[PDB]
Amino acid sequence: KVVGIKGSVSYLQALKYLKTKKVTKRLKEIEKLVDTLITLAPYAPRKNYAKISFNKIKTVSRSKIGSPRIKSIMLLLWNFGLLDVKIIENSWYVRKTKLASLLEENFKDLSPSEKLKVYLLGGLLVDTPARFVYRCTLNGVEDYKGVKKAILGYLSDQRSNSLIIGLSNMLESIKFIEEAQAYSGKKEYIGLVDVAFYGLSGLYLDVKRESGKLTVKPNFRELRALYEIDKSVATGSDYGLSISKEILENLANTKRRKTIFSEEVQELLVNVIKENAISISQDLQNMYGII
Amino acid sequence: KVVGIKGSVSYLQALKYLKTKKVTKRLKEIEKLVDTLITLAPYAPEGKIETIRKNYAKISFNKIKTVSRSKIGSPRIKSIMLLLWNFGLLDVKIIENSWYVRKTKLASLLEENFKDLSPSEKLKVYLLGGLLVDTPARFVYRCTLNGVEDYKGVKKAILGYLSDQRSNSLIIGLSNMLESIKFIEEAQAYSGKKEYIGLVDVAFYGLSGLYLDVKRESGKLTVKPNFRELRALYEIDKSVATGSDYGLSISKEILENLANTKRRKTIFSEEVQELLVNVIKENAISISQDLQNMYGII
Amino acid sequence: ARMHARKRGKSGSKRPPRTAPPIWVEYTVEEIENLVVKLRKEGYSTAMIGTILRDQYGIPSVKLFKDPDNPNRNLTITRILEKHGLAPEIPEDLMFLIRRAVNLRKHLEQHPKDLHSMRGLQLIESKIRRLVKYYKRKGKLPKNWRYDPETAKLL
Amino acid sequence: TLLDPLANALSHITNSERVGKREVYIKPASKLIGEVLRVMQKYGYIGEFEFIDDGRAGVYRVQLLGRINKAGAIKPRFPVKVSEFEKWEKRFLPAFEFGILIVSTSQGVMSHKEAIEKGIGGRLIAYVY
Amino acid sequence: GKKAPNGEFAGRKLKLKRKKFRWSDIRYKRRVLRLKEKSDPLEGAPQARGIVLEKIAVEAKQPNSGMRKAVRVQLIKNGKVVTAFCPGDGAIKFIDEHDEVIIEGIGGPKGGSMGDIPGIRYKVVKVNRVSLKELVKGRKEKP
Amino acid sequence: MKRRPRKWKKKGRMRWKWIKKRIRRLKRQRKKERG
RNA sequence: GUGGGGUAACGGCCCACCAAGCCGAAGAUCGGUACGGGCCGUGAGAGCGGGAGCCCGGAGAUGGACACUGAGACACGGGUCCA
RNA sequence: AGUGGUGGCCACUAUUAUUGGGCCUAAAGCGGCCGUAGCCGGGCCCGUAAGUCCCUGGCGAAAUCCCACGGCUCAACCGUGGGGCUCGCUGGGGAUACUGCGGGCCUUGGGACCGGGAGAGGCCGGGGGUACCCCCGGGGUAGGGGUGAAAUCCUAUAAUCCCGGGGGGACCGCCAGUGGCGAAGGCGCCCGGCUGGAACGGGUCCGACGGUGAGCGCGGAAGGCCAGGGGAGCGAACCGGAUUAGAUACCCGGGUAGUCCUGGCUGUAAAGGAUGCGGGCUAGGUGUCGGGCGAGCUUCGAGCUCGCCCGGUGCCGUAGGGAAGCCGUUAAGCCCGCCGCCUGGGGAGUACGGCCGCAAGGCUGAAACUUAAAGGAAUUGGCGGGGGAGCACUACAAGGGGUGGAGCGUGCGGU
RNA sequence: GGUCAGGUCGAGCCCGGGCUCCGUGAGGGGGGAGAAGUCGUAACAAGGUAACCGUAGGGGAACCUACGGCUCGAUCACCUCCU
């Protein structure tokens, strides 16, 4: 009910190093952890799931990793829509989504950092919770209150049906994140919005804790780099959110940012998205849609 | 995330006996458990994750025992707690393996007014009080009035009611019911396998304890009203206009049936009825901000 | 004692088949009345009264003497304590069992983990409840009388 | 827990006999048991017997004459009218009148042959031959 | 311990006990619940009329070796398909494809299989309203 | 799940423990694919 | 329960009101099954199984539903509609 | 003048068992305990007549059934006459033995108190204990370890081994037994506290207060699971070395969960005495355990030997049982009370369904179809990469000759 | 005897839903006899690592291993009952 995690508020903060070529122990640890979960997930092309006994599935890598870290990475994977997760009270279940097994078999031969980055971008492409937070950034959000306003706007258009579940849960999380920050200066717990900010942080953003808050800034060169590809296949609604002129212009007038990956990777990803846009959309509806 | 109870799917089927005066050991445990839970719940408004675990009460179910030296199953306690939260009497938060509970101001008010009253009627007055004020109770009530008979109408009503932004007092709770509906109706509408209780279900219960009868044996939980009492309940709801209609009105088909009925016995005696009326009329705005906190963002 | 321990041990005790009381008893019915009222005045229940009477005073048994107030009944200590208003209300054995019950419940309170005494409690409680049910079938208790740990504490 | 004096008594008698001792001491002595003991003694199946006031329940002392093939107690006290004894006799005897049956009747418990002569049914209690 | 109860006033529970254990046997429960009459392909009929489709020969179970002739038939009554054994010598020669036949049970233990043939529950008696045995003797002529 | 002692005699048979476990694994997978 | 209605006739059979009863673990409720008896087959008998053939009682006239004549009817060989 | 084949029903069948069945080894007693309704219940006195029994009126209609007689030639059938037919009901009179119900008496069963004795009866506080691992200081060179052999591995940045000192976690040796205690799984270091009881001796008390238990309730080995701590050794998985045709093992080197404390769940086992519990009876022989009594011994401690009584624990054993194994007063012999279970073998403890548990799972649970056996005990032989005894020449130890390399005689295979 | 107004009984028809029965129907597993194919050596003599049970993991399979229990266990021998 109170889907929050302790003692790891900075654990994902390490993920910033994904875009840069550096790698630290925690980064490769995260990479192996996500590999373990993503391969552990069943996939049928409460009936197609698997239960995660943390004590059992923490020695699978002879590591003795903390449970809160596993919880956090599970939440991240859900946020980016690669993993279907359900939580019977004090219990977690996992199922592999359509995007997974469309990225896994296709793009297994790259470096761990490459695989992580391509997964996160894939989650960005299509109208996931991640795509919502990204479009929110395009509108110029920088704090949890901005997302509160944005989702409160979005729920009152009657187009939010395809994703209403996700934003409902986000608002629920916010209801106590605000407590954990507004009066509580010591951020004891983490929340969904924080997890969403991370992942993007390791992709194109900057995240700095501020006495409970999660003050966020963009990086316009890489933001433009990903914006071009987003425009390349616009198979995701903007949620009726207006990109502010400031951001759109700042994307212009700069030294052209490189392709963040190899062009063959980008075009092949574009291909697989286009060739499966419908099936992934239906799957996503099942994740978050209502009808 | 999903919220719901396994196994005890019929345990609240005995709540319908409240309408009549049949007495059962199932009910005898039910209401004693209700008021034990009300007892252990404190009223320390406060509320913040740190406030929980400080001014909330931890529940260890194993100690919670019947007066028989024979224990009471956990899922029943879970179901009943969720129910009487759903009717606004408790505030329950679930940190893993430690459920934390606190009294809503309606609690320790209905109790305080009625300390020397019969158990079955005590439980009845708790139910009515919960329904009268702005809770999901009132939502499903007006949904029934509009002529909704199962989860489908509840879902459509939710989608409509969130389409105003006036759905701000009871938004988050309604969303919770939406999620439970989404993950439960499927197995309770397709393949008809009956193993979990949703918030729509338990909501139909209690009302079935008051003025409904619910046929479960359809895969779904399809419910019909009792106009005889419903005239009295419509009267008392309009007697204290302290809970909004949620922009959904009674269909004329229900209204004509309501007018046709004879004068059903008041759900209670008249002195306690007026005592309830004027105490609820008292502290109207305070309970409004309390339900705003519990089920609303601001 | 077989009914729970299920051991057929025989530590019972025997009384010879005497119909009339023996001659060597130098006390009479009124004298034993004086002594028994003295004894229960000193704060003893029937078992210890009779033990000491048969021990120091030597009279083998008061059941060998016929009550003057009835020819068909043989005199008993309980009846005598009923004569003067010195019989107890709650029968003695059951009062003892209540006292032991509150004792064990306290020790158990300060010691939860000894499930052996949990079982012992279960046993002594079935014992008291059987005795009470029987006495209800006889009616020497108020019908509304029913065990409660708290009133036992008051006891 | 002792529940039926008579069955224990007759079983005790038979168990003495198959050994063939001389003296038996039925501890559970009752008036009905004594009447019974009179019954077959009137057909000399036993020798003399005596009652002993033990102060508790009486004890019956009995001599055997070594003439009891088997003496059982019909426990479920079947009531029987006069006209059908041959069925119940055949239920508990080896041959025609080869022994007796003890019936409790309105007048007093005693054997069955006379009860046919007096023509009064009753309740079977014991058989012996 | 002693078989119980046996008392004057205990007849009820003794009766209940025996009714409970009356479900322990097989024949009574088979009769009362009428299992055959919902599994029967013959619908309680001693003899049934059928139309034959195919000739099939089988091997005697070991150590008995021998090629037993039989036929598969569709019942005119309901339409199920069942095999009937042909007894005699040279029996199959008389029977041919698409022949009206009359068929009864083999008389095995509990009606089951007999001897050295597996599962075959039936034998023909008349083919085209002419009895098999005399054709086995040859006294009569098949139509 | 009231195991028959007769089945525990290994004559013409596999060890009963393992047949029990095999039935359990089959149970697992069947209930899984059902739901 | 009170007070009436209609009936050949008593009654919740109906109706207006007043009450909260009544049945269920010595198994209601629900389903499966099925006209009941005199009897018959078998057994040394205890018992087991079955109600086709005669007699007695009950129910029906393809299914439903509704009238008239009448002492007697909702009438196999009388009437009306629906399927 | 019928017989044969098939199908269904009673007997066969004590394989449906009240008459009249089994549950140690053949399928069948649940792991243990508590207890509600129900069922079965000590004796004596007074009453009753509800049950129970005897007599008596009405009634249970006919036909069918049993019997004698008459008619049909006899028979079957019919008639006359007598019987009882499920017969269940009902009016009335008498009997009180027992069962029921009411009033009184008694203890023998049971419960209750009191005195010493016994015990791994518990929970709790403290104290230790030997051994092990790690670590530090000293000595010491040149290996240790392990196996059938070795190997992996540790070691010369001083390994193995000895002395000194410190840390840690578990566990409580010999005393230990055919001791003790526990309802059962189970329970052992010393001291102090808290509690539960049992047997023994006294009937001093109560007066059948009972026995069993469908429904209910409780704790309940290992392992597993949820949350937290801890993690010496050992060690699921896993990782190496070795063995092998193959090694997924057995052996060896490591090593995770586990094994420990805290709180909760999970309700399982060859939880087996493969023996559900209570009462009455029944030849004996003998030991220990514990309580009591009486003798003998006494360095005077119920400290040491002998007889008896009671309870627990064996062993042998008469009668007696049982297919036999075997059992046999601690019954699996004979009687009385209650509960559960069983009805050929697989299919199967499965399918569906229900209920429970977070999960793995638990508690209930069929059918089709298929089979002549499955299964139990014991007899003889056989066999053992079982165990003892004894034999030496178709064996071996001591000793001794020589075949196989070359040529030929002769045989067998081969061509 | 026709037309209309009201009350009542009451099949037959349309729409929505639940229930179950029957047939077919892609696809999936296991059950069982057949004789041969083939991987294995699991149990029985200590069946060659004794055997079996409970819980968990692994393995193509018999299985293997982990911990608690058992003689339906053996190899003298064994503490030691009996002798």
mmCIF file of C-alpha atoms (C1' of nucleotides) in Angstrom, chain D residues 1-5 7-8 11 15 18 21 30-32 56-57 75 77 79 81-82 91 104-109 119-123, chain H residues 18-19 40-45 51-54 95-98 106-109 210-211 278-283 333-337:
data_model
loop_
_atom_site.group_PDB
_atom_site.id
_atom_site.type_symbol
_atom_site.label_atom_id
_atom_site.label_comp_id
_atom_site.label_asym_id
_atom_site.label_seq_id
_atom_site.Cartn_x
_atom_site.Cartn_y
_atom_site.Cartn_z
ATOM 1 C CA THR D 1 -15.266 -47.884 34.853
ATOM 2 C CA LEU D 2 -17.483 -50.650 36.187
ATOM 3 C CA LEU D 3 -20.894 -50.348 34.576
ATOM 4 C CA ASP D 4 -22.742 -53.703 34.659
ATOM 5 C CA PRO D 5 -22.475 -56.017 37.687
ATOM 6 C CA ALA D 7 -22.033 -59.453 33.085
ATOM 7 C CA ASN D 8 -18.824 -59.208 35.084
ATOM 8 C CA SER D 11 -17.953 -63.853 33.027
ATOM 9 C CA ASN D 15 -13.463 -67.854 33.790
ATOM 10 C CA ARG D 18 -12.638 -73.295 32.633
ATOM 11 C CA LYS D 21 -11.509 -73.628 40.919
ATOM 12 C CA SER D 30 -26.432 -56.782 44.395
ATOM 13 C CA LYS D 31 -29.928 -57.944 45.280
ATOM 14 C CA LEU D 32 -30.710 -58.740 41.654
ATOM 15 C CA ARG D 56 -19.136 -51.080 50.525
ATOM 16 C CA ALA D 57 -21.228 -53.165 48.089
ATOM 17 C CA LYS D 75 -26.668 -57.379 27.794
ATOM 18 C CA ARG D 77 -32.138 -56.758 27.789
ATOM 19 C CA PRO D 79 -37.970 -57.913 25.895
ATOM 20 C CA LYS D 81 -43.373 -62.238 24.838
ATOM 21 C CA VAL D 82 -44.292 -65.823 25.670
ATOM 22 C CA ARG D 91 -30.227 -67.926 19.991
ATOM 23 C CA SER D 104 -37.146 -60.531 34.461
ATOM 24 C CA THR D 105 -40.944 -60.573 34.598
ATOM 25 C CA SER D 106 -43.665 -58.578 36.335
ATOM 26 C CA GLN D 107 -43.558 -60.929 39.330
ATOM 27 C CA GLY D 108 -39.794 -61.328 39.841
ATOM 28 C CA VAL D 109 -36.665 -62.351 37.986
ATOM 29 C CA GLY D 119 -47.166 -67.897 30.572
ATOM 30 C CA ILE D 120 -45.579 -64.499 31.283
ATOM 31 C CA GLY D 121 -43.064 -62.801 29.010
ATOM 32 C CA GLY D 122 -40.462 -60.394 30.272
ATOM 33 C CA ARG D 123 -36.962 -59.115 29.623
ATOM 34 C "C1'" U H 18 -27.815 -56.615 15.302
ATOM 35 C "C1'" U H 19 -28.066 -62.460 14.933
ATOM 36 C "C1'" C H 40 -23.493 -46.610 27.731
ATOM 37 C "C1'" G H 41 -23.344 -45.990 32.916
ATOM 38 C "C1'" G H 42 -22.239 -48.370 41.103
ATOM 39 C "C1'" G H 43 -25.415 -50.288 44.948
ATOM 40 C "C1'" C H 44 -29.773 -49.558 48.959
ATOM 41 C "C1'" C H 45 -34.939 -47.489 50.543
ATOM 42 C "C1'" G H 51 -41.231 -47.984 28.603
ATOM 43 C "C1'" U H 52 -41.576 -53.474 29.500
ATOM 44 C "C1'" C H 53 -45.310 -57.695 30.289
ATOM 45 C "C1'" C H 54 -50.535 -60.438 31.004
ATOM 46 C "C1'" A H 95 -48.170 -56.715 37.275
ATOM 47 C "C1'" U H 96 -43.644 -53.764 38.892
ATOM 48 C "C1'" A H 97 -38.763 -57.450 37.812
ATOM 49 C "C1'" C H 98 -35.696 -54.066 35.112
ATOM 50 C "C1'" C H 106 -24.168 -45.318 51.068
ATOM 51 C "C1'" U H 107 -19.446 -45.207 49.511
ATOM 52 C "C1'" U H 108 -16.377 -49.097 46.364
ATOM 53 C "C1'" G H 109 -15.637 -45.583 40.715
ATOM 54 C "C1'" G H 210 -18.272 -41.310 35.298
ATOM 55 C "C1'" G H 211 -16.510 -43.840 30.175
ATOM 56 C "C1'" G H 278 -11.968 -47.474 30.281
ATOM 57 C "C1'" G H 279 -13.744 -51.664 33.536
ATOM 58 C "C1'" G H 280 -14.005 -57.299 35.356
ATOM 59 C "C1'" C H 281 -11.661 -62.201 35.156
ATOM 60 C "C1'" U H 282 -7.444 -65.222 34.210
ATOM 61 C "C1'" A H 283 -0.901 -70.814 36.173
ATOM 62 C "C1'" G H 333 -7.625 -65.267 25.526
ATOM 63 C "C1'" C H 334 -13.287 -64.354 27.606
ATOM 64 C "C1'" C H 335 -17.037 -60.796 28.819
ATOM 65 C "C1'" C H 336 -19.089 -55.191 29.361
ATOM 66 C "C1'" G H 337 -18.925 -48.982 27.094
#
